[PDB]
Structure 1
Amino acid sequence: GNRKRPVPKGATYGKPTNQGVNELKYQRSLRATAEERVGRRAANLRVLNSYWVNQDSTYKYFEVILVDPQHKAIRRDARYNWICDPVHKHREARGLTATGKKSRGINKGHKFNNTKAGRRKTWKRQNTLSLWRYRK
């Protein structure tokens, strides 16, 4: 389904363009949302990614996979040693996963000029007035 806005009796208060309840798409998919919920139960493990397995009509099924950033077999090995770093602390909660970079739009292209290095980072960057001591 979607993400109905929490409005009492349907009371939003604003412009008609700013009064949506049912037609709220939510910029995130259920695949990405599922990873973050399990990232709250097993919040001690560094979640990897998941993939759609089954479906019905009310529920979307995804298969999750994680690793142990404390187990010596995982802490070592130059194949997955990067997971044991603080910058890799719950990559999904932000969107550093495969499905999170799809929903965010982290891609190379002329179709992604508003999200080259950051959605709102690019916004702030272009709108900032770079003033030199010697105004050019």
Structure 2
Amino acid sequence: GAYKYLEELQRKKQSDVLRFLQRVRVWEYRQKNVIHRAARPTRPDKARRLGYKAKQGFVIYRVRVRRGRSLRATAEERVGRRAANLRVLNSYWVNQDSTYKYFEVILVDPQHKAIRRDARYNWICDPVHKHREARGLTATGKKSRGINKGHKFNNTKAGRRKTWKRQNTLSLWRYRK
């Protein structure tokens, strides 16, 4: 439906329409706290394509971070400490200033019974996903860990400490090679 039009509207970022929305919102988000809850995602098309359903249990925290370790991961880490019961799913850029950057990190309540039911999202309830951001298991964390497929990512594919310990410790068999 509209998500194609919004998808293409969000492309032209410095264009007249979206330029004006930035300068109003950048002022408005400075009035509010560092870490605070938005009731609805400002870029809802982006929220969806990062796994947000507009049902009870999903929370959109807006977060402010300084400019000049990665800022996206710091943004997720800040909301992780404040909203400890929640689990960080994904985050995205909304607006930026000369001094600050804003992200609208999306969260899921594993304790809320609307999530413990449906099988599309009940995986986040499993204790292996406590603080996904504190281990770099989010989108931006996996990006900064250099975890992809290719010749580029040879020395850091399946854990950069794991491949180091494998390469720099002697291995001996019962009947020596």
> TM-score by structure 1 length?
0.78
Q: Secondary structure at the match of 2:128?
A: helix
Matched, 1:102 2:143: yes
Q: Which runs of 4+ in 1 moved over 4 A?
A: none
Matched, 1:84 2:131: no
Q: Which runs of 5+ in 1 are unaligned?
A: 3-27
Residue of structure 2 in register with 1:67 after alignment? 108
1:129 equivalent in structure 2: 170
> Could you tell me which amino acid in structure 2 is paired with residue 61 of structure 1?
Y
- Structure 2: state its 5+ residue gaps: 1-66
Whichever residue aligns with residue 137 of structure 2, its letter is L
Q: Secondary structure at the match of 2:107?
A: strand
Deviation at 1:45, TM superposition (A): 0.6
Aligned counterparts of 2:100 and 2:135: Cα–Cα separation in 1: 24
User: For residues 33-52 of structure 1, what are the structure 2 equivalents within 5 Å?
Assistant: 33-52=74-93
Indicate the percent of aligned positions where both proteins have the same amino acid: 98
Aligned residue type for 2:151? H
Total equivalences in the alignment: 111
Q: CA deviation at 1:133?
A: 1.6
Three-state SS of the structure 2 residue aligned to 1:99 is helix
CA RMSD of aligned residues (A): 1.0
Greater helix proportion: 2
